[PDB]
Design a protein around this nucleic acid. Structure first.
Ligand SMILES: [Mg+2]
Ligand SMILES: [Zn+2]
Ligand SMILES: [Zn+2]
Lengths: 79, 1337, 98
RNA sequence: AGCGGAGAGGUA
DNA sequence: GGGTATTCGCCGTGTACCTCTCCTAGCCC
DNA sequence: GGGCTAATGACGGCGAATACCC
């Protein structure tokens, strides 16, 4: 569940780019067709997003990797 | 879409480009059919379609004809919204002056023409003429004439020479003015005028010219020829209840202007005589000047019911203009309002919320999820389902409000905790349930307070809510590091009843294996809740690297403390729960829990405190009764002796042996002592009321009287209030402001009688009036403070410098009143801490001083710590991170962006609702004596006396820090001196307040030099002794015939020679001022330390804070010496008594007139430093800036207003006051321009000039020599390069007009204008966004 | 009292005031300062653009909620543009740059 | 869809 | 003529909300 | 009745505008 966003700050030391990384990710999970990378509790996209920030498998860098790499999938499918 | 905003004057070409037609007719509506007219104010063919895609004639009722205009009535078929932006115009017949540029005070036209405003008012109102195109005349170009002087000029130079009237003539002057010629001629006169006044007027003139030509303006543009009219939808004409139309003031105004204009054009065709059309143009100018800014002419015109109508200046200015009412604060959808109630069962990351509010708020969410589940096809079917309230949509709402935070607000939203996010849990009922701890943050009791809910719609907003504004985040105030989650009143009663101990009850002294048998005892009803028991407990310490070490013991405690101990998590020592736990104890309990264990166990720990607090406050049952308040029996006798004592003093006044003032002072003193005797009687007879047997004889202990437990817990009230319940209350003040001689001898437990209740009624009414008018100030204070900080975003990581201010713990003159480890705590050091193991480096030069480092500072007794402050932070357009330190709500350094200007100004201005509105030296403790800046001599007896005013007496302790500080006046008889050990409790000084002594320095003879009886000194025989003494008169009492002499005393030897100053070659003669009485007669061989003569002799409320940030020059300013060197006096009362200052090395052109009401500090033989004191009175801020520097004036502010809040005991950490000071002295002026481009006597902001010469440092050339200024907050707000924020603040007219003739352009770089324009704020998340956007351009 | 979305005012496309007119709450100035005190920008940016003033942006918002997107398109406050036509309706040329 | 200004009282 | 010195006109004066009434007259038709 | 219309009870403060004084 959700009580604090403490440890999310403990992996992202800005507490503001927490909001942009989280908004980028949860926007990629609501509009885009992607599953969560964490088992959900029938939560919303928000707590799933910050909850993925808790396990550290998403920050700004990995999101750069997926925008670039799925971007090259949009290049390689273009032929 | 767009960057910066530029503003300028209106060309008529630009006006005609804006418009789409000349509005000609004053009738608007037909009101028979509802169509408007051909070309009225409401016009279809100029402004566009009334209804949607239809012409007014009704030709093209189809969307297919979109774009083409019609021919029947010529209405361009478009959207009806196109009638919202299409402006109009009016070709006036006469030229017409704009009223703002006429009467902005200072007038732009007035100093533009070098012409007084009186005459220009006379020109525009047709009661004088004026010259244009003089030539071969005796008539100057600006010469104004009356009508009879126009007759004389009509005879004399009535030839081809011209002269006109009205705005045509002003149009001719501004039309025919050249610019560069007056730039050369008036810079030429800045050379040619030594006059400061002409230098000031002509430098304001030179700013208007050199800014006017640089701007895209023309002078004749100010006279409005073509008046633009407002689009009609913005000035609508609604029906009232009936077939009438509610009036707009605008349409009345334009109705008058179009009437007067059309009658004027008809008077121009028919060619009436000049006096009729003079009156017609005069009424037109009154009309347009009424429309632009009504009321700036001395009488307004009234529309109906005798009421001043609302011009466009009243469409912008004031509390109901667009900035106050429709731009900064907007009404918002997705919101609701309701009464709050408690619901204690909630956790603090959730709040209660009613069901019907939820179903009405969350309608689009319910609609979307019904489309998701397919239980509804269209928007009307879903809308009918949520109108129907089916049992499926409650499950849908329970889906969508699973993790959806909401933003609650309370209406007086003082500091930043006023909106907090929560999660809803749906409630059977109609009121918001709200978690109780949050009440203390909201300042919200449950007496009927109403709180509003808002809903974040977008996903970023939900993440901003849960990440930042969730209530678990806000546990520490930005004002101070204290917890704002303080358990307020019931829960602390449950604890102070829980953790208490009586000596004899159930289960005394037994042994129990842990707290689980304790709670098993208490729920069984076999042992007492409070009876002292040895138990076994097991605690944990995180001394290792986060590793919790176990230990167990058999503590002496009570049962309730064990039941409390089952809640407290692992990281705490048991001594946190071993005391009685009042309010301060539970507060620092929570604070240590956050400092040690972090956030999550602190939060859920606080919840478990609250639940067990109501469980045991509930189960305890602490009532209140009339038997609970105890009258002391000894009250009546102290009343009796009080009446006896005022009976005796009254008897002494009966025959008249004491004065009325003596009776008043004596009576108030004996009532005060009597009152405190009664207070000790009731306080003892409450606090040790209980006497119980211990199983032996007896013992006394603390009392279970309930009103004492509510007192000593600190839940409600104090010893003063519970004093007022039992003992007699007070000496109530009077409406005059004095005190009342008959105190209320009775309390609230007995009845009041009548007149005592009358006087107490005065006390209450004065209190409540102070609350209302007090808040009426306080909102305006916080208003100005946030409208002067406003701009200030933590934007860099380091300045990389080493300036700063010096924190020392303040010592007001007694005990230390704010220690070092509160002022220093959480701020980044300027350089390293040089330990007093001296040349030992305790902390480095950039380390944040958290609690460990502050303890290491504490053990080594660090005296003064220099530290990086925001006032000296060398950040450009911002504040670096390493000059601010802690957020005080996050236990680390500040993040880059969270705008400390606003959190500063709210955190300063919020406790203003809790403020108020309306000999010798006796040392205390035992230590070493240090003196500061001493110039002294040992007298004939051996006591030390000081010949310098500015010597400060410090009591250093045993270690080396200062622990007392004192002022030692001029010629004060000390008992001890430097390096001398004094005893704890010694009188260490003396002086006479009714004597300014003129003490000696060495010994020798004294000759009365220039002391002639009748001219400088006068003969007065002493009436009481016989050894008379000549009295030195002052300046004005003697006549001028013998005033030019200066009486002095020169130490001379047995030859008459010069006995000099020890060390220099000047004699020690004392030029005597007035009211000096030299007691020692002529030729007295004198000693050291003896008086050569005797010269005998506020409000700290909220307006103190206001006038500090306003920085007013106070009543009698303590004047200072601008520069060092020896000084003397000048001319006797040429208005004032002049000074003559003389430096040693530099020149001395500076001297200054002095008001002779001031007993000066300095003499003719006295040499000062620059910025040294000359007189007494308050210490005015400007001179403290321009003499003693920046650090002195910010230090004076923060210690001053910190004393103001510190007296009432509300903590504000100093950085907020410091950063408001940083916004105060942001502007500056120039001493020498150098290779820059500024005018020398010009004001510009320090940031822009610091980057100006800093980039002239990029070349080898020398930039400027700046000089900082100190503006008040309400003027430094308005003098801001962004004009739009200054339009949002006060005096909108002056801001916009100075913007207009300035041609000012605004790149906006700020907060409030971005609230205006409605984009992302460059504050937090939007500061990352402007990192992106400024990173791209 | 509560309000999702009801009527809009005439001279400014803003929610009405009061309860007898089915109107929203006033999100007043002091708590705009309080949002500035937090780092909440997107909260504020939808407080006084989408939920308040711009008619296009709240049509887009209403469509996006009923479809299942949470995203805002700012546009411009209408009321600021009204202020622009007011100051422009005096003898003042005021524009926007590129 | 049809809601602007005064003036009065109250609510915390 | 400068050099204060008064004085004299303008700006300001708490935050939301609730309830109610009451909203042009002149006038000659 | 009705279609249509053409004042005096603030106070503080602050910078320009005389006042007057030498
Ligand atoms: Mg209340
Ligand atoms: Zn037509
Ligand atoms: Zn810095």
């Amino acid at each position: 569940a959700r009580v604090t966003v403490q440890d999310a700050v403990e992996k992202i030391g800005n507490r503001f780019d927490l909001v942009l990384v989280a908004a980028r990710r949860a926007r990629q999970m609501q509009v885009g067709g992607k599953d969560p990378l964490v088992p959900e509790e029938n939560d919303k996209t928000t707590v799933i997003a910050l909850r993925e920030i808790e396990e550290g498998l998403i920050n700004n860098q990995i999101l750069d990797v997926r925008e670039r790499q799925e971007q090259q999938e949009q290049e390689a499918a273009e032929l | 879409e767009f960057d910066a905003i530029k503003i300028a004057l209106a060309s008529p070409d630009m006006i005609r480009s804006w418009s789409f037609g000349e509005v000609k007719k004053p009738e608007t509506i037909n009101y028979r059919t509802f169509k408007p007219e051909r070309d009225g104010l409401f016009c279809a063919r100029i402004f566009g379609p009334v209804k949607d895609y239809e012409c007014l004639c009704g030709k093209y009722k189809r969307l297919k004809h979109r774009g083409v205009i019609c021919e029947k009535c010529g209405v361009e078929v478009t959207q009806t919204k196109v009638r919202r932006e299409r402006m109009g115009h009016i070709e006036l017949a006469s030229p017409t002056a704009h009223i703002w540029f006429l009467k902005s005070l200072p007038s732009r036209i007035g100093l533009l023409l070098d012409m007084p405003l009186r005459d220009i008012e006379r020109v525009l109102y047709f009661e004088s003429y004026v010259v244009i195109e003089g030539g071969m005349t005796n008539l100057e170009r600006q010469q104004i004439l009356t009508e009879e002087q126009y007759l004389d000029a009509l005879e004399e130079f009535g030839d081809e020479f011209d002269a006109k009237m009205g705005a045509e003539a002003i149009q001719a002057l501004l039309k025919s003015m050249d610019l560069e010629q007056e730039c050369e001629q008036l810079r030429e006169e800045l050379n040619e005028t030594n006059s400061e006044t002409k230098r000031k007027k002509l430098t304001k003139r030179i700013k208007l010219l050199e800014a006017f030509v640089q701007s895209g303006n023309k002078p004749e543009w100010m006279i409005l020829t073509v008046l633009p009219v407002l689009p009609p939808d913005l000035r609508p004409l609604v029906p009232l209840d009936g077939g009438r139309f509610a009036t707009s003031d605008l349409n009345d105004l334009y109705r008058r202007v179009i009437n007067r204009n059309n009658r004027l054009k008809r008077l121009l065709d028919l060619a009436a005589p000049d006096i009729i059309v003079r009156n017609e143009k005069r009424m037109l100018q009154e009309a347009v000047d009424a429309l632009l800014d009504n009321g700036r002419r001395g009488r307004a015109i009234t529309g109906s019911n005798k009421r001043p109508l609302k011009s466009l200046a009243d469409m912008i200015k004031g509390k109901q203009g667009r900035f106050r009412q429709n731009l900064l604060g907007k009404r918002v959808d997705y919101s609701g309002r309701s009464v709050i109630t408690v619901g204690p069962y909630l956790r603090l990351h959730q709040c209660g919320l009613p069901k019907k509010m939820a179903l009405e708020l969350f309608k689009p969410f319910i609609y979307g999820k019904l489309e998701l589940r397919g239980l509804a096809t269209t928007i009307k079917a879903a809308k009918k389902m949520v109108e129907r309230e089916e049992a499926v949509v409650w499950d849908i709402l329970d889906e969508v409000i699973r993790e959806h935070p909401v933003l609650l607000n309370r209406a007086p939203t003082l500091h930043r905790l006023g909106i907090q996010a929560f999660e809803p849990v749906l409630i059977e009922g109609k009121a918001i349930q709200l978690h109780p701890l949050v009440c203390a943050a909201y300042n919200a009791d449950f007496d009927g307070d109403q709180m509003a809910v808002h809903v974040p719609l977008t996903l970023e907003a939900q993440l901003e809510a849960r990440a930042l504004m969730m209530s678990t985040n806000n546990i520490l105030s930005p004002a101070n590091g204290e917890p704002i989650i303080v358990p307020s009143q019931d829960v602390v009663l449950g604890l102070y009843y829980m953790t208490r101990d009586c000596v004899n009850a159930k289960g005394e002294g037994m042994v129990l294996t842990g707290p689980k048998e304790a709670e098993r005892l208490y729920r069984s009803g076999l042992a007492s809740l409070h009876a002292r028991v040895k138990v076994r407990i097991t605690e944990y310490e995180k001394d290792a690297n986060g590793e919790l070490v176990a230990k167990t013991s058999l503590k002496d405690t009570t049962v309730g403390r064990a039941i409390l101990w089952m809640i407290v998590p692992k990281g705490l020592p048991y001594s946190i729960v071993n005391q009685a736990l009042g309010k301060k104890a539970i507060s620092k309990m929570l604070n240590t829990c956050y400092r040690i264990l972090g956030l999550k166990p602190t939060v859920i720990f606080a919840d478990q405190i609250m639940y067990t607090g109501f469980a045991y406050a509930a189960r305890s049952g602490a009532s209140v009764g009339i038997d609970d308040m105890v009258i002391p029996e000894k009250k009546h006798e102290i009343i009796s002796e009080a009446e006896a004592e005022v009976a005796e003093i009254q008897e002494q006044f009966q025959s008249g042996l004491v004065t009325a003032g003596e009776r008043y002072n004596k009576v108030i003193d004996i009532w005060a002592a009597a009152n405190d005797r009664v207070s000790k009687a009731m306080m003892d007879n409450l606090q040790t009321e209980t006497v119980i047997n211990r199983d032996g004889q007896e013992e006394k202990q603390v009392s279970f009287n309930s009103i004492y437990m509510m007192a000593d817990s600190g839940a409600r009230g104090s010893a003063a209030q519970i004093r007022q319940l039992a003992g007699m209350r007070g000496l109530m003040a009077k409406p005059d402001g004095s005190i009342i001689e008959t105190p209320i001898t009775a309390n609230f437990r007995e009845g009041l009688n009548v007149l005592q209740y009358f006087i107490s009624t005065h006390g209450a009414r004065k209190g409540l009036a102070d609350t209302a008018l007090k808040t009426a100030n306080s909102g305006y204070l916080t208003r100005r403070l946030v409208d002067v900080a406003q701009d200030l975003v933590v934007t860099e990581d380091d300045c990389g410098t080493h300036e700063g201010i010096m924190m020392t713990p303040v010592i007001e003159g007694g005990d230390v009143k704010e220690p070092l480890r509160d002022r220093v705590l959480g701020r980044v050091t300027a350089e390293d801490v040089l330990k007093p193991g001296t040349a030992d480096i305790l902390v480095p030069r950039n380390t944040l001083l958290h609690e460990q480092w502050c303890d290491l500072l504490e053990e080594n007794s660090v005296d003064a710590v220099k530290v990086r402050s925001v006032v000296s932070c060398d950040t450009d357009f911002g504040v670096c991170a390493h000059c601010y330190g802690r957020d005080l709500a996050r236990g680390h350094i500040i993040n880059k962006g969270e705008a400390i200007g606003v959190i500063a100004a709210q955190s300063i201005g919020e406790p203003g609702t809790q403020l108020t509105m309306r000999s010798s030296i006796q040392v205390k403790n035992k230590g070493s004596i240090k003196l500061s800046n001493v110039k002294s001599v040992v007298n004939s007896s051996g006591k030390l006396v000081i010949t310098s005013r500015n010597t400060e007496l410090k009591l250093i302790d045993e270690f080396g820090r200062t622990k007392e500080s004192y002022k030692v006046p001029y010629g004060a008889v000390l008992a001890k001196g430097d390096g001398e050990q004094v005893a704890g409790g010694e009188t260490v000084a003396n002086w006479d307040p009714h004597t300014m002594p003129v003490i000696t320095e060495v010994s020798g003879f004294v000759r009365f030099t220039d002391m002639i009886d009748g001219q400088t000194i006068t003969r007065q025989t002493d009436e009481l002794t016989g050894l008379s003494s000549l009295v030195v008169l002052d300046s004005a009492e003697r006549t001028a015939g013998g005033k030019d002499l200066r009486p002095a005393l020169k130490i001379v030897d047995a030859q008459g020679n010069d006995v000099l100053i020890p060390g220099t070659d000047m004699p020690a003669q004392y030029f005597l001022p007035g009211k000096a009485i030299v007691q020692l007669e002529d030729g007295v061989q004198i000693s050291s330390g003896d008086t050569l003569a005797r010269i005998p002799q506020i409000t700290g409320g909220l307006p103190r804070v206001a006038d500090l940030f306003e920085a007013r020059r106070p009543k009698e300013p303590a004047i200072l010496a601008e520069i060092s060197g020896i000084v003397s006096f000048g001319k006797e009362t040429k208005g004032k008594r002049r000074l003559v200052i003389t430096p040693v090395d530099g020149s001395d052109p500076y001297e200054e007139m002095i008001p002779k009401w001031r007993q000066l500090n300095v003499f003719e033989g006295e040499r000062v430093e620059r910025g040294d004191v000359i007189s007494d009175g308050p210490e005015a801020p400007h001179d403290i800036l321009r003499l003693r520097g920046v650090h002195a004036v910010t230090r004076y502010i923060v210690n001053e207003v910190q004393d103001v809040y510190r007296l009432q005991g509300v903590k504000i950490n100093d950085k907020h006051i410091e950063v408001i000071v940083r916004q105060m002295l942001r502007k500056a002026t120039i001493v020498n321009a150098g290779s820059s481009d500024f005018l020398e006597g010009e004001q510009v902001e320090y940031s822009r000039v610091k980057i100006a010469n800093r980039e002239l440092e990029a070349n080898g050339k020398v930039g400027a020599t700046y000089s900082r200024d100190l503006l008040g907050i309400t003027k430094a707000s308005l003098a801001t390069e962004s004009f739009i924020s200054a339009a949002s603040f006060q005096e909108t007219t002056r801001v916009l007009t100075e913007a207009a003739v300035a041609g000012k352009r605004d790149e906006l770089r700020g907060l409030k204008e971005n609230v205006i324009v409605g984009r992302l704020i460059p504050a937090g998340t939007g500061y990352a966004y402007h990192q992106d956007r400024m990173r791209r351009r | 009292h509560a309000r999702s979305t009801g009527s809009y005012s005439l001279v400014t496309q803003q929610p009405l005031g009061g309860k007898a007119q089915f109107g929203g709450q006033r999100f007043g100035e002091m708590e705009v300062w309080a949002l500035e005190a937090y780092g909440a920008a997107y909260t504020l940016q939808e407080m006084l653009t989408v939920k308040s003033d711009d008619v296009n942006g709240r049509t887009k918002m209403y469509k996006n909620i009923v479809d299942g997107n949470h995203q805002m398109e700012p546009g411009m406050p209408e009321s600021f543009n009204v202020l622009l036509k007011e100051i422009r309706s005096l003898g003042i040329n005021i524009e926007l740059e590129d």
